[PDB]
Amino acid sequence: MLKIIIPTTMLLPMTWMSKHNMIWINATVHSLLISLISLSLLNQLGENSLNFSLTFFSDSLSAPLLVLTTWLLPLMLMASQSHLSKETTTRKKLYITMLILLQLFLIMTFTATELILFYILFEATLVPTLIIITRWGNQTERLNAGLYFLFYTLAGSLPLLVALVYIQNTTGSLNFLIIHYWSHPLSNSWSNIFMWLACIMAFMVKMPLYGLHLWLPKAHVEAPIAGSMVLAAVLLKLGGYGMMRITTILNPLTNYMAYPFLMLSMWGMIMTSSICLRQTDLKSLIAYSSVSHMALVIVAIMIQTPWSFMGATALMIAHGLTSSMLFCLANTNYERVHSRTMILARGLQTLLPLMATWWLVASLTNLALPPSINLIGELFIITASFSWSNITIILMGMNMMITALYSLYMLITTQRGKYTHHINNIKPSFTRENALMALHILPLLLLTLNPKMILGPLY
Amino acid sequence: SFPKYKPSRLATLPATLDPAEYDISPETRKAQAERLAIRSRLKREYLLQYNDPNRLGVIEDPALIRWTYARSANIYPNFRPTPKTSLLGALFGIGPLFFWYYVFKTDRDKKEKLIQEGKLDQTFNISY
Amino acid sequence: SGYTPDEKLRLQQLRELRRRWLKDQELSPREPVLPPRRVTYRHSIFAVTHVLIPVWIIHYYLKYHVTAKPYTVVERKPRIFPGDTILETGEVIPLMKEFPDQH
Amino acid sequence: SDAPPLTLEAIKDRVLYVLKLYDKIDPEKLSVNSHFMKDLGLDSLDQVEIIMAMEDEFGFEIPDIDAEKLMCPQEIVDYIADKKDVYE
Amino acid sequence: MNPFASLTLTTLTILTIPIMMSNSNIYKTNLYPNYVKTTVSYAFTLSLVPLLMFMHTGQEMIISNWHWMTLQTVELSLSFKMDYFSVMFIPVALFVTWSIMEFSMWYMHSDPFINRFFKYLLLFLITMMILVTANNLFQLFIGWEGVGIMSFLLIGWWHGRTDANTAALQAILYNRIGDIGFVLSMAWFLTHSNAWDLQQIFMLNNECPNMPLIGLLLAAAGKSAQFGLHPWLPSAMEGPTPVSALLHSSTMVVAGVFLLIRFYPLMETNKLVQTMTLCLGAITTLFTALCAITQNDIKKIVAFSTSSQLGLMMVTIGINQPHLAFLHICMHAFFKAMLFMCSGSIIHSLNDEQDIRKMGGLYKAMPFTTTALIIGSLALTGMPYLTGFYSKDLIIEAVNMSYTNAWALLMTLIATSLTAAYSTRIIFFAFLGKPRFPPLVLINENNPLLINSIKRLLIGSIFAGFIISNNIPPMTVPNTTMPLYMKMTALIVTIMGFMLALELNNTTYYLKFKYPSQTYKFSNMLGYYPSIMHRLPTYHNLSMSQKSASSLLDLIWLETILPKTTSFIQMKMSIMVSNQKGLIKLYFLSFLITIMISMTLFN
Amino acid sequence: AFSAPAAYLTHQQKVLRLYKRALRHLESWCVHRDKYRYFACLMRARFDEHKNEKDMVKATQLLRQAEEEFWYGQHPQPYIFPESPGGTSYERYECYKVPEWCLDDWHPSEKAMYPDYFAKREQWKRLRRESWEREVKQLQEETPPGGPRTEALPPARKEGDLPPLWWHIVTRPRERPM
Ligand SMILES: CCCCCCCCCCCCCCCCCC(=O)OC[C@H](COP(=O)([O-])OCC(O)COP(=O)([O-])OC[C@@H](COC(=O)CCCCCCCCCCCCCCCCC)OC(=O)CCCCCCCCCCCCCCCCC)OC(=O)CCCCCCCCCCCCCCCCC
Ligand SMILES: CCCCCCCCCCCCCCCCC[C@@H](O)O[C@H](CO[C@H](O)CCCCCCCCCCCCCCC)COP(=O)(O)OCC[N+](C)(C)C
Ligand SMILES: CCCCCCCC/C=C\CCCCCCCC(=O)O[C@H](COC(=O)CCCCCCC/C=C/CCCCCCCC)COP(=O)(O)OCCN
Ligand SMILES: CCCCCCCCCCCC(=O)SCCNC(=O)CCNC(=O)[C@H](O)C(C)(C)COP(=O)(O)O
């Protein structure tokens, strides 16, 4: 695993020693090379795992997330190239350093053979993201947003640490292999109930769960484009990865401890999908759509069936890609309008046809159009929930309909209609933006050819 | 002697059927004149800002920003806990959760009982 | 009722300007300056490059790759009627029992 | 469609054609610059009837705020030409 | 060896070549529409051969060429079904699409983006072929969503028009309401039968329970525009006329009926689902005919005619005659597509006018369209020995001699009478009276594309019914014996409809005026369903979406409970702790108190 | 559309509007030409029996009851011209209307084509450049204190002047640009 960690570390001295007008080229090229190297991890095996050493190991749940994390950085660099043009060389190097540190922390988090190291890196990811949100944020609310994005997370995970060490005082180890092989049931007791709560609430808050999601619209709206990319695409999947890793010791208590969370997620998907219908902001709409998709993933994880896990993994990957592309499109519109309001900019297919095509494809992918991996995860989770209970489909069905609605609404209000007359600063889309859109959308349609690469270890 | 039109919330009353567009008073005419005056002032301002060849940007609308701020970032500071607000919040945020919990719990209890007693015909139910 | 003199004057000026602009919207005979640079028969070639080649590719793919695996192409067994002869065996199928034919 | 590009002369000819079939107006006295209630002594109802007759003639309907102040055949022609973007 | 599978796959793959070429240089020239039309015609000619092979022998086949993925014990693969329905419906759809494209080459000449229109039509055709030839539920769902997306993209062809966008969103909404039931059916089938393959579903389901069939019926009602979810089909006429002629008349709307036909082994085992299907079809056909009888837009009337025919086919499904319903699909394709083509020709020749109040004497002013529409209306009304007689007449005989709901039978008879009546209305109001259009006459039919495209569908609607009926093997028992009055019931009711409609229409010539009645207002406003159902529910939902979900819960109470309460408590504690005047008197008084308390408490 | 609206509609305007609406809905009801002509003349006569009504309090009660009658028999599906706000082709070509300033963003390779049109375009731009500076002063001097009362603009009064705020009215794209 060091063959990928070491180049990510070496990205920092290369950036800090580069010329004042050549940092972006070097960063993008070497990030793409690192992603190409990390593509090797996709060759998983039906056997146990790729146990590299005592500290790092790779599974078919960790491999797609690692590949997505490595692939995200070049896209974030291309997205941030624009609004950091008038920025001093030292501050641009600091921004690239923060991005590289975040990628390194995520890469070390996704392997994380030991659970305490996983938690330490899980919380280490919080610092560069907070710095990015609070420093390079345009609006005045960013600071408050950052505060939220911090405290919620910590409020979730401070008990977890205690629980973690408590386990090592009883079980004696926190290595995931030993934990899996020496698993023992949790008796129905109040102490076990609170241990379950401490283990679960840590990852519930960052997913986020409905009722604990108030930090997410603030963090995504107030953050710069790269921050929105990293939060929507990868940083949301940390909770799901942690839950799928840690639910191996919570049985059979979960069989009755998942009812409040299942109810909360199955109603919050509807609530957030309806919230998306009436939104005056594009970024808030995308954030609430992300909340709905993550609530569906939470339902899948709480069901705890093989089809649930497969659908959860596929949906996480597809949602990360789709949300990243949607945030990029919204930022491209904002950089010309400088308002971030849906109804101010209208009739854009007359002026930017290729951007309208990109918007259509992104909306269709969000709308879960077959045979995309989005719908693969959707159908897997839906069938698993139907097996769990034949009534859930009703709620699920409603969500699907509502989803499509707001998606096309986002497509119709911004692209269709008559253009705004008093906006004459709509320049033709650059090659950079179109290349970013293509690099976002082509991997989705290529992954739909080989779904088993993102279906997880239970395929 | 024709049937009378009854306005509703989703089917409003026509202007020609307004019983207030006839009993005209000089105060009403003055109000209409002032409305036209302010509308013309706003239109003149917008047209002056719109036909300027030196402008190469978006004409900022204070009304749009005010609407967005009122819809988004002003709800909480004007919020006051009142019996109406408290009851509506409790209902809309608690009732559906317990309703769905009861429904799903009853369904799963019936399913588990049928599993235990044994007549459910689970044949070919391999993938779950 | 009708136009005021100011309205008439403004309308006339605006329509004169509009007509001038609309006339200016026309094109000269050489206006689209194109820069040149280069680096039965129609149906005959169409039937080869759009029909024959797909038939060849699909026939190869079905005959030598799809049918290489079992149960990929399954054919409903042909209907069998009395008096028929099977090519594989050659035996004749017994006829009916000479039911009473009347109208 | 294959619709010919109607010109100012065609519009004026059709306007006069519609006006002359209106027997309440003397065909030998009507002119392109003839006013309605002054040169021809018409009424407002006759004016709106002429407006609607032209509306059916040209296949498009003029808003009331613009129709109630079209008082001469020449300005009706010019209004139609401005609406249809006629060059010459 | 085995030419059948090769040809059946080849027609589908050669339907795809222009999509690949859309990035080439030909897409930037004016030869693209002719290229696509020639491709479609060649595909139809190639696909004519598997139909002949099936007709000669009865050849059936399923091809599982590419294995997609194995989920434990469930294998998903790209499987195509080449049964009777598929190999019979491919040539009909291809012929109709060829005619519609040749019509479009003339109708849409003034559109700057005509190549995009043609590629959209070809994409819709490909999605429909995928839907029809699908052998597993996943591929069927892929086609089900592809046809819906293509319909959405083609309805809102003119993005400037708000009504087009509203109609597209409405169609998407109703199709997703159907998608709910479709997903329910797939989930149940995989949970119980452990397979999305049709073969395993048929083997493992000797008696099908209510839930999967109810889901399938819901999806079929959603896409076929049954009475519950009907208004989207009449609203979908905002798009260009070729879109309505191809998609929303004869090809895409019969997809729900085709879905119900594909599951006929499971439909015959359940008796309640059949009753529900019969009732839904009867109410749909009656309501749509009653709406159509009093409309004034030609496109809206033809759309309601299509909806009524779909309801009749759903009735046929409900009386356990799937093959007869498929036959009616095949004939309706021909004659309804030609009817829409004639309507589009009338609209184009009449300067983009759709209302029939401005259509006068076109029997002589433009005769070819007149005779084509007369032939199509005669075929629609089931005139004997036409394409519509050989299906609709059998429908009527089957529904009369079946132990079914009597109310549904009465509704079907009244629907047939009303069909005759609004066909009479169209002919009378579009071709008989004096001209009522603007004086600038621009009527012109002298274009070879229009004439040839219409004449091919004329030949179809005249002879294809006979050819198909006499050239297919029998798949149902015949109603050999018939009461003499019951045999002629369809003809009698159709003639009565002609007579009454003509007599009531001839009264408009009279110099008498009277205000409309309540029934006329009910029928003209589409039964008030579009109004109420588009204002009462949505508003409420939207209101809630801002009142309870957005403002009250998310922005007020969820913000008050966790973060704001914590901030308030911490601020109050900080104020209390830090509010010290700096007096050491108080400090050491507290020191004395704590020294006193510790000794007593901890000893 | 082109004319500015007033603060209110007089009785004459309301009567004319009701007459036009009644005629339109009558021709919608009376499909045929002869029947429509007969009933339109009859309705003009019945509308004419109260032309010479003198007192305004009685003439406003006649039109108030005429608006209650029209609504009852208003033909819930009236005839609408195709390009009217209710017609089938109302905003069909609205997406083909591209603003003129978009031509400022064309690549020089694209501007190599059509040179004469662009030369005329800079000519028009210069004309507007001086005209706007003149019009600001003209409109500022001609406006009454406290702001305008009606949104009607004055014409040009000098020789070389152009009407104030003329650029976005004369540079309409077209009725059918494509
Ligand atoms: C077993 C022996 C077999 C032989 C049996 C006997 C043979 C036949 C006997 C004849 C039976 C009736 C024939 C008369 C046909 C009607 C023609 C007519 O008079 O229409 C003019 C007249 C209004 O004309 P208008 O408004 O002055 O004209 C406007 C302008 O002229 C502007 O006009 P426009 O130019 O725009 O367009 C004119 C258009 C517009 O006209 C309309 O306004 C459309 C309304 C008429 C359609 C009604 C026809 C069928 C009704 C089915 C209803 C099913 C149940 C509905 C449930 C309702 C629930 C409340 O009219 C038409 O185009 C033609 C109308 C339809 C005639 C063609 C088909 C009918 C003949 C076949 C019917 C039955 C025979 C089937 C054979 C089966 C074997 C037994 O319509 C009516 O007065 C309605 C009469 C029938 C309505 C029935 C529904 C009443 C429900 C009210 C509530 C009841 C209590 C429910 C309580 C529920 C509590 C829960
Ligand atoms: C706000 C955004 C979401 C955040 C997360 C929300 C979800 C948190 C809920 C955690 C799970 C449920 C809590 C307790 C579960 C115990 C099981 C209980 O529900 O069942 C009954 C228990 O009855 C009562 O619940 C007993 C406890 C009552 C006192 C607890 C307070 C309940 C309301 C508090 C709401 C405050 C929420 C906010 C906290 C900050 C059955 O009684 P019994 O079978 O005999 O005993 C079961 C336990 N045994 C087997 C170990 C002996
Ligand atoms: C975004 C806000 C989320 C905040 C976190 C929510 C989850 C909080 C769950 C409790 C946190 C601490 C749990 C303890 C960690 C597990 C350790 C354990 O299980 O050991 C238990 C210890 O159990 C405890 O001590 C639990 C006491 C809880 C103290 C802290 C209370 C915090 C508030 C409780 C109510 C909140 C529950 C619902 C929260 C919903 C989310 C806000 C057994 O101890 P022994 O003595 O060794 O065995 C006994 C037999 N010899
Ligand atoms: C199918 C739907 C049917 C709807 C029917 C609606 C009811 C129709 C019957 C209406 C009854 C009436 O006349 S209501 C009578 C309303 N009251 C008056 O008309 C009094 C004064 N009239 C005016 O001042 C006019 O302007 C005038 C002088 C006429 C012209 O003026 P001009 O010289 O400046 O053109």
TrEMBL record, chain A:
Membrane spanning residue stretches: 21-41, 61-80, 92-110, 116-133, 145-167, 193-216, 223-244, 256-277, 284-303, 309-330, 351-369, 389-412, 433-449
Main EC class the enzyme belongs to: translocase
Job description of the protein: Core subunit of the mitochondrial membrane respiratory chain NADH dehydrogenase (Complex I) which catalyzes electron transfer from NADH through the respiratory chain, using ubiquinone as an electron acceptor. Essential for the catalytic activity and assembly of complex I.
Membrane topology, as annotated: Multi-pass membrane protein
Superkingdom field: Eukaryota
A Gene Ontology molecular function term of the record: NADH dehydrogenase (ubiquinone) activity
Keywords: Electron transport, Membrane, Mitochondrion, NAD, Respiratory chain, Translocase, Transmembrane, Transmembrane helix, Transport, Ubiquinone
Gene Ontology BP terms: ATP synthesis coupled electron transport
Family membership: Belongs to the complex I subunit 4 family.
EC numbers, comma separated: 7.1.1.2
Keyword Transmembrane helix attributed: yes
Domain (NADH:ubiquinone oxidoreductase chain 4 N-terminal): residue spans on this chain: 1-109
Subcellular location: Mitochondrion membrane
Residue ranges occupied by any NADH:quinone oxidoreductase/Mrp antiporter transmembrane domain in the UniProt entry: 112-401
Organism, scientific name: Sus scrofa
Any Gene Ontology CC annotation: mitochondrial membrane
Binding partners and assembly: Core subunit of respiratory chain NADH dehydrogenase (Complex I) which is composed of 45 different subunits.
Coiled-coil annotated spans: none
Reactions the enzyme catalyzes: a ubiquinone + NADH + 5 H(+)(in) = a ubiquinol + NAD(+) + 4 H(+)(out)
Protein's recorded name: NADH-ubiquinone oxidoreductase chain 4
UniProtKB/TrEMBL annotation, chain C:
GO CC terms, sorted: mitochondrial inner membrane
Subcellular location(s) of the protein: Mitochondrion inner membrane
Primary subcellular site in the record, as a coarse category: mitochondrion
Membrane topology: Single-pass membrane protein
One Pfam family from the record: NDUF_B6
Entry keyword set: Acetylation, Electron transport, Membrane, Mitochondrion, Mitochondrion inner membrane, Respiratory chain, Transmembrane, Transmembrane helix, Transport
Any Gene Ontology biological process: mitochondrial electron transport, NADH to ubiquinone
Domain of life: Eukaryota
Transmembrane segments: 44-62
Family: Belongs to the complex I NDUFB6 subunit family.
Function: Accessory subunit of the mitochondrial membrane respiratory chain NADH dehydrogenase (Complex I), that is believed not to be involved in catalysis. Complex I functions in the transfer of electrons from NADH to the respiratory chain. The immediate electron acceptor for the enzyme is believed to be ubiquinone.
Subunit structure: Complex I is composed of 45 different subunits.
Name of the protein in question: NADH dehydrogenase [ubiquinone] 1 beta subcomplex subunit 6
Organism: Sus scrofa (Pig)
TrEMBL record, chain E:
GO terms for biological process, alphabetical: ATP synthesis coupled electron transport
Membrane topology listed for this record: Multi-pass membrane protein
Reaction equation(s) it catalyzes: a ubiquinone + NADH + 5 H(+)(in) = a ubiquinol + NAD(+) + 4 H(+)(out)
InterPro entries: NADH_DH_su5_C (IPR010934), NADHpl_OxRdtase_5_subgr (IPR018393), ND/Mrp_TM (IPR001750), NU5C-like (IPR003945), Proton_antipo_N (IPR001516)
Keyword annotations from UniProtKB, A to Z: Electron transport, Membrane, Mitochondrion, Mitochondrion inner membrane, NAD, Respiratory chain, Translocase, Transmembrane, Transmembrane helix, Transport, Ubiquinone
Residues of the NADH-Ubiquinone oxidoreductase (complex I) chain 5 N-terminal domain: 68-118
Family under the similarity heading: Belongs to the complex I subunit 5 family.
Protein name as annotated: NADH-ubiquinone oxidoreductase chain 5
Enzyme Commission designation: 7.1.1.2
Location(s), subcellular: Mitochondrion inner membrane
NCBIfam families given in the database record: NDH_I_L
Example of a GO cellular component annotation carried by this entry: mitochondrial inner membrane
Record function comment: Core subunit of the mitochondrial membrane respiratory chain NADH dehydrogenase (Complex I) which catalyzes electron transfer from NADH through the respiratory chain, using ubiquinone as an electron acceptor. Essential for the catalytic activity and assembly of complex I.
Regions crossing the membrane: 6-27, 39-58, 84-105, 117-134, 140-160, 172-191, 211-233, 245-266, 272-294, 301-319, 325-347, 368-386, 406-432, 453-472, 484-504, 582-603
Primary location: mitochondrion
Domain NADH:quinone oxidoreductase/Mrp antiporter transmembrane: 134-418
GO molecular function: NADH dehydrogenase (ubiquinone) activity
NADH dehydrogenase subunit 5 C-terminal domain ranges (all copies): 422-601
UniProtKB/TrEMBL annotation, chain F:
Annotated spans, Disordered: 135-164
The family this protein is said to belong to: Belongs to the complex I LYR family.
Protein name: NADH dehydrogenase [ubiquinone] 1 beta subcomplex subunit 9
One Gene Ontology cellular component: mitochondrial inner membrane
Keyword vocabulary terms for this entry: Acetylation, Electron transport, Membrane, Mitochondrion, Mitochondrion inner membrane, Phosphoprotein, Respiratory chain, Transport
Membrane topology, as annotated: Peripheral membrane protein
InterPro entries the record matches: Complex1_LYR_dom, Complex1_LYR_NDUFB9_LYRM3, NDUFB9
Residues in the signal sequence: none
Pfam families: Complex1_LYR (PF05347)
A GO BP annotation: mitochondrial electron transport, NADH to ubiquinone
Assembly behavior: Mammalian complex I is composed of 45 different subunits.
Compartments, as annotated in UniProt: Mitochondrion inner membrane
Functional summary from the UniProt entry: Accessory subunit of the mitochondrial membrane respiratory chain NADH dehydrogenase (Complex I), that is believed to be not involved in catalysis. Complex I functions in the transfer of electrons from NADH to the respiratory chain. The immediate electron acceptor for the enzyme is believed to be ubiquinone.
Domain Complex 1 LYR protein residues, every copy: 13-71
